[PDB]
Design a protein around this nucleic acid. Structure first.
Lengths: 122, 50, 198, 58, 113, 148, 80, 335, 156
RNA sequence: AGUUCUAUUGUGUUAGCAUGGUUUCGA
């Protein structure tokens, strides 16, 4: 209203609150949080991690199936690193070379874990 | 068998009255002037005797 | 176990960086309670007449809904697992003393009234009342015990509702007459026919 | 136990509206259920709606 | 039974007048075996249209007040007539206190959700 | 014709509760004539309620019939529908003859079978809620554009 | 390979000529005037089209013609 | 690090494109529990592997229209019965309750997005940064134009393809009381949280009034017989109190119930913190808590007290290092 | 009261909107009634008569809409609805993938670049499934994945 | 059918108030 006849003799309360609120949160600070509201928070509780997804996928597998499957994977992997590009010793890429080493270490680690410490549980 | 229904009727009305007391308690708590006047009254009582 | 359990509800998690109100009441409450009985040390927690337990409102959602407190902080009392009067925040100093006085009476040394002004005034640096038992206190204690059918404890409270008082008969009169009947119907020997008729 | 229904006749009379330019009722108003009306279940088969209030305690 | 009254003040009403007005009212309450419940304030309120009250002038806004009480049912007429004679009060109404719907026990979560 | 009698239609009241708990039944068979939602014998809504009334004839109560009907139809989804879908999907993976490594003159070079394992190509899953299908079409479009 | 099993034949998809509303029969002379007013606010006329649906009532000077009987008999003769 | 610029901060999340940012995978930290090490190690095998893939997997084709004008109307109307208290929208953030996390079709996006970034090897390999910049703008334009392609039920779809409007059958206005389809916006206001509407509810009576200020009939507001009489009383009384217009609709400055002014502010702020999570709102309430202890804070306290899910999640992560997956299998073993 | 603003519109077009506004509120009807004094008896019969004619007009108005709508589209509805009618897809080409039981039979009646295209294409599929070319291409039989692979080893 | 209690109220009576057609006034 342009006319100087409205409510004038009053105290502003909104500003007071805001003014006092700068102590806990500066004006230059962020306006929004990554967590978001209820809609956003639900998402974070449903999405799974990279390591979690792998365990769930192979949860139903057993020792008799995992060991056999792994041996087949490394068997063909080596065949493509000794006679794939004829006889070479300096490939331009390190895709299969880097994957072969990682799988080999896992097999060695399994050998050390026999039962817990000793052959017998006594 | 009529006496059996007498006990049931007493229990039925008893539950209805219980809910009524809760509503009145709210008013008392929610009321500010009631408490303020009451508080003041008590204070003067002891001062006059002392 | 102690039948009276005082639950102190507060929300100090949000004020970990800048105390505004939550810590203000803790400083005064922790310094006044010990002086009136003579978070807290385990040694001094056994001499109190009620079980003082603290719970955080802004830590557990299940408990927050059960109490359903419109405000924060606020003192909530209990007696034999039952709701009791709740002291709202922002009250005067006299209100706080009142709540504590009634808390120690439900369970049933104490500071005499002559030395009450010094205890309260001296506890404010950190930065009982002369009224007898309340009428509602005795009535609330007899209504719940009659279900348990006591023998020796029931007679005591029956005798403390009529002696040199003759001041409250429209409220406590109804329970007084029925209280005597229960006692007469508890003795092993048959009751007296003449006594019941009168 | 075996009990038969009672007569549908009741005291009073049918609703009547006073004549003339002054519109007013004589005995009963518009909200009058006759004793020969059908059951409420058949008259309102739809029942309360989903957006209706479940507590008419105004 | 319990009763409620909503009084709309004017711009020409100071705090002096408000205290006086309420004190007068309490006289009647006590007379009829009653007791005041609580007194609250609602602040200012915008009016949809201009109010033209005779011998008072024209106003566009006012201060809205609310107070609860309880007395005999016959005390409503006496109270209603007193407000009209007094200056400042341009509009008022008395509403009976209901069980569920009330300004005491039911004041939260109205506009939100 | 004297033996003709009129019976009360119990499906009007029984069907109201079924849709309230599971309102995702109207989506199925929507474009077909006869079905109205402002139902045909073949509609899921009519099938589920039919078993409830039949079971009650033996002596079961109204509430007990709901539990029995829910479990009876649940097995058909997991033991027949789910098994059928999964069985068919498996065969798709085997169709890896397009890869050059499938026949020599080895590590596969194309990721065609890998994509079909997650159910994205010619092998789509079957859900129950209508919201799941609404979001599924969104994903497809998203991935389509990025290819280009 | 997850498409619909049944063909699409719903009325909503394919508009057709029908009346999705019921009303008591109205006198021919009463409805004739109403229809004329609508036409003033500017093939076969609308009055005749509505008559086939049995919308009007059987008044004194208006009766529903009987079905064709003399031009609908078609029988076959064979031994037995 | 090397010249690594993922698509997460160069392609989208600017101007128009930040409107929707759906999270695919959670983030714990950079270096920490075993989960952090696996995330980067799995990434290392990738990237360089995108270069040796063949060009046959690129099954690119034109996107033809899916839903026709006559078909989208049926789907739009049938989807309102399941939730008449809300409007249909692509709620991508709540897909977990309807789609299994493992069978989520959105997973493909994650893989695909990483590829596009990696494929931009031309930044400085062949032509240099000179021309690289130019090409970047091209991709932004393309995506912005086609932003409407992800919503067939929306009006954007039709505009793109350029199809004529639908011609629904003429529905009669006069209907029996048995059939009624009130709008979602007005349906929620009628219930009023199972509370009868009174003269104090000024923000709800503004809907049941015409331009001239007359009382609408029972065939327009679509309300029950009992509440129709109550509504007429509330609006009538408000006018006598000079709290409602007499020949026009209310203004924006009079849409507030009869309550404590301070209560309004508090209540208002709580909704914002729950929908989008405004930081400013949270701060305001914090201060007000102490300043006005005599106020209702039930909703504010409950929301904060419900943040315990973050603390418990730490225990699950801590046990994950010791192969403690038994907590997840038990929850899934429901049957 | 009604107020309208003219913006990029001819005066005649705007004037046609306000004219129809009075009909909804019966502005004209009320203006004339108050001019002349009407006896209470006449209003008793007039008020009742308006409750029978107006409802009939609404039903007839909807009927005219269908005639115009159907005229521009032709067609006509008939008694075609029958419960005893299975609405099955006509010609219905799309079907489930073969289970390998019928694949072999197909090659038996198609051996004879046009018609010989299938040769060496589907045959390699069968060999690959049995595991003849590649050691990793061997698939699983249909009789060893349902008996003790899905009915007992279910994740749930 | 009838009595008691509880929810519900454009049915009878009711003095001041608000709005409005007509009418009235012109520091």
């Amino acid at each position: 209203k342009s006319i100087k006849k409205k409510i004038t003799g009053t105290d502003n309360v909104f500003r007071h609150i805001m003014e006092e609120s700068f102590a806990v949160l500066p004006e230059d600070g962020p306006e929004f949080e990554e967590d978001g509201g209820v809609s956003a928070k639900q998402q974070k509780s449903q999405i799974l991690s990279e390591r979690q997804r792998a365990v769930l996928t192979y949860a139903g597998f057993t020792e008799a199936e995992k060991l056999r499957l792994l041996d087949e994977k490394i068997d063909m992997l080596n065949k493509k690193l000794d006679e794939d590009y004829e006889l070479r010793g300096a490939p331009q890429n390190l895709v299969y070379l880097q994957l072969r080493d990682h799988l080999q270490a896992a097999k060695i680690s399994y050998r050390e874990k026999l039962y817990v410490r000793e052959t017998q549980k006594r | 068998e009529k006496k059996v229904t007498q006990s049931l009727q007493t229990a039925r009305v008893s539950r209805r009255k219980v809910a009524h007391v809760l509503w009145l308690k709210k008013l008392q708590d929610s009321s500010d002037f009631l408490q303020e006047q009451e508080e003041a009254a008590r204070g003067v009582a002891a001062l006059a005797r002392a | 176990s102690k039948p009276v359990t005082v639950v102190y509800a507060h929300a100090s998690s949000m004020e970990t960086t800048r105390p505004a109100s939550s810590a203000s009441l803790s400083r005064f409450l922790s310094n006044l309670l010990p002086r009136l009985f003579l978070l807290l040390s385990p040694s001094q927690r056994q001499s109190l007449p009620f079980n003082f337990v603290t719970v955080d409102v802004a830590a557990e959602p299940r408990l927050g809904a059960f109490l359903a407190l419109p405000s924060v902080p606020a003192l909530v009392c209990f007696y034999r697992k039952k709701l009791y009067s709740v002291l709202a925040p922002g009250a005067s100093d006299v209100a706080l003393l009142r709540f504590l006085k009634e808390a120690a009476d439900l369970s049933e040394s104490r500071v005499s009234p002559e030395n009450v002004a010094e205890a309260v005034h001296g506890a404010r640096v950190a930065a009982w009342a002369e009224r007898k038992d309340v009428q509602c206190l005795l009535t609330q204690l007899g209504v719940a015990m009659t279900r348990e059918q006591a023998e020796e404890v029931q007679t005591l409270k029956n005798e403390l509702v009529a002696e040199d008082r003759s001041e409250d008969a429209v409220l406590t009169g109804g329970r007084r007459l029925f209280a005597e009947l229960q006692l007469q119907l508890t003795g092993d020997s048959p009751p007296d026919r003449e006594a019941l008729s009168t | 136990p075996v009990v038969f229904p009672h007569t549908r006749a009741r005291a009073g009379g049918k609703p009547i509206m006073m004549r003339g330019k002054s519109g007013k009722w004589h005995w009963l108003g518009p909200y009058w259920k006759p004793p020969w009306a059908p059951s409420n279940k058949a008259r309102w088969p739809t029942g309360p709606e989903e957006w209706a209030w479940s507590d008419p305690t105004r | 039974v319990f009763y409620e009254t909503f009084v709309l003040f004017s711009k020409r009403v100071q705090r002096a007048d408000i205290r006086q007005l309420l004190k007068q009212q309490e006289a009647l309450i006590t007379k009829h075996h009653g007791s005041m419940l609580a007194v609250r304030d609602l602040g200012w309120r915008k009016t949809a249209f201009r109010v033209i009250k005779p011998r008072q002038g024209i106003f566009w806004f006012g201060r809205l007040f609310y107070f609860s009480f309880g007395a005999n049912p016959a005390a409503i007429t006496e109270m209603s007539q007193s407000l009209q004679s007094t200056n400042g009060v341009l509009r008022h109404a008395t509403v009976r206190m209901k069980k569920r719907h009330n300004l005491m026990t039911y004041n939260h979560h109205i506009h939100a959700r | 014709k004297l033996m003709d009698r009129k019976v009360h239609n119990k499906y009007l009241s029984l069907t109201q509760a079924v849709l309230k708990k599971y309102p995702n039944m109207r989506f199925q068979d929507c474009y077909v004539d006869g079905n109205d939602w402002s139902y045909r014998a073949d509609h899921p809504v009519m099938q589920f309620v039919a078993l409830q009334l039949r079971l009650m004839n033996l002596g079961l109560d109204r509430h007990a019939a709901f539990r029995e009907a829910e479990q009876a139809f649940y097995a058909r989804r997991m033991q027949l529908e789910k098994q059928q879908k999964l069985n068919m999907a498996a065969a798709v993976v085997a169709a890896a003859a397009r890869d050059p490594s499938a026949f020599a003159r080895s590590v596969p070079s194309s990721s065609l079978p890998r994509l079909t394992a997650m159910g994205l190509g010619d092998v789509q899953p079957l859900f129950t809620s209508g919201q799941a299908y609404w979001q599924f079409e969104i994903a497809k479009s998203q991935a389509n554009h990025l290819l280009r | 390979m997850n498409g619909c099993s049944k063909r699409k034949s719903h009325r909503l998809l394919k508009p057709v000529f029908e009346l999705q509303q019921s009303f008591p029969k109205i006198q021919h002379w009463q409805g004739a005037e109403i229809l004329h007013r609508l036409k003033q606010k500017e093939s076969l006329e609308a009055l005749k089209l509505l008559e086939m649906f049995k919308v009007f009532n059987e008044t004194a000077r208006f009766k529903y013609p009987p079905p064709p009987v003399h031009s609908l008999v078609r029988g076959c003769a064979f031994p037995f | 690090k090397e010249d690594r610029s993922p698509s997460f901060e160069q392609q989208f999340l600017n101007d128009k494109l930040l409107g929707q940012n759906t999270l695919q995978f959670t983030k714990v930290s950079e270096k920490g529990t075993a989960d952090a090490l696996f995330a980067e190690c799995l990434e290392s095998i990738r990237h360089r592997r995108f270069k040796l893939d063949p060009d046959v997997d690129n099954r690119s084709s034109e996107a033809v229209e899916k839903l026709t004008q006559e078909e989208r109307a049926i789907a739009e109307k049938i989807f309102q019965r399941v939730d008449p208290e809300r409007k249909i929208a692509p709620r991508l953030e709540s897909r977990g309750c309807y789609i299994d996390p493992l069978w989520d079709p959105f997973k493909r996006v994650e893989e695909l997005q990483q590829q596009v970034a990696q494929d931009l090897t031309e930044y400085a390999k062949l032509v240099g940064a000179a021309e690289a910049r130019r090409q970047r703008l091209l991709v932004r334009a393309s995506l912005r134009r086609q932003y409407r392609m992800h919503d067939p039920l929306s009006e954007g779809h039709r505009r793109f393809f350029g199809a004529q409007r639908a011609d629904p059958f003429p529905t009669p206005h006069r209907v029996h009381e048995r059939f009624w389809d009130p709008s979602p916006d007005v349906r929620v206001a009628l219930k009023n949280n199972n509370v009868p509407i009174s003269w104090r509810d000024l923000h709800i009576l503004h809907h049941f009034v015409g331009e001239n200020g007359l009382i609408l009939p029972r065939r327009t507001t679509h309300a029950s017989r009992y509440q129709q009489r109550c509504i007429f009383k509330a609006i009538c009384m408000a006018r006598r109190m000079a709290l409602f217009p007499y020949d026009w609709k209310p203004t924006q400055g009079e849409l507030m119930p009869v309550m404590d002014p301070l209560q309004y502010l508090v209540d208002e702020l709580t909704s914002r913190y729950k929908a989008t999570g405004d930081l400013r709102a949270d701060a305001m309430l914090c201060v007000m808590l102490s300043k006005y202890p005599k106020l209702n804070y039930f909703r504010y306290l409950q929301y904060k007290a419900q943040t315990q899910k973050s603390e418990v999640e730490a225990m699950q992560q801590q046990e994950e290092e010791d192969r403690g997956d038994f907590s997840r299998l038990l929850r899934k073993y429901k049957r | 009261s009604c107020h309208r603003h003219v913006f990029r519109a001819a005066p005649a077009a705007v004037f046609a909107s306000v004219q129809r506004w009075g009909r909804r509120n019966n502005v004209h009807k009320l203006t004339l009634l108050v001019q002349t004094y009407e006896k209470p008896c006449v209003k008793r019969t007039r008020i009742a008569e308006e409750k029978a004619y107006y409802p009939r007009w609404f039903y007839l108005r909807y009927a005219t809409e269908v005639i115009r709508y159907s005229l521009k589209h032709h067609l006509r509805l008939g008694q075609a609805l029958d419960p005893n009618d299975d609405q099955r897809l006509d010609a219905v080409k799309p079907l489930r993938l073969p289970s390998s039981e019928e694949r072999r039979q197909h090659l038996r009646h198609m051996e004879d670049v046009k018609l010989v295209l299938d040769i060496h294409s589907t045959r390699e599929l069968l060999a690959l499934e049995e595991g003849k070319h590649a050691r990793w291409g061997k698939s699983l039989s249909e009789e060893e994945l349902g008996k003790l692979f899905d009915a007992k080893r279910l994740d749930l």
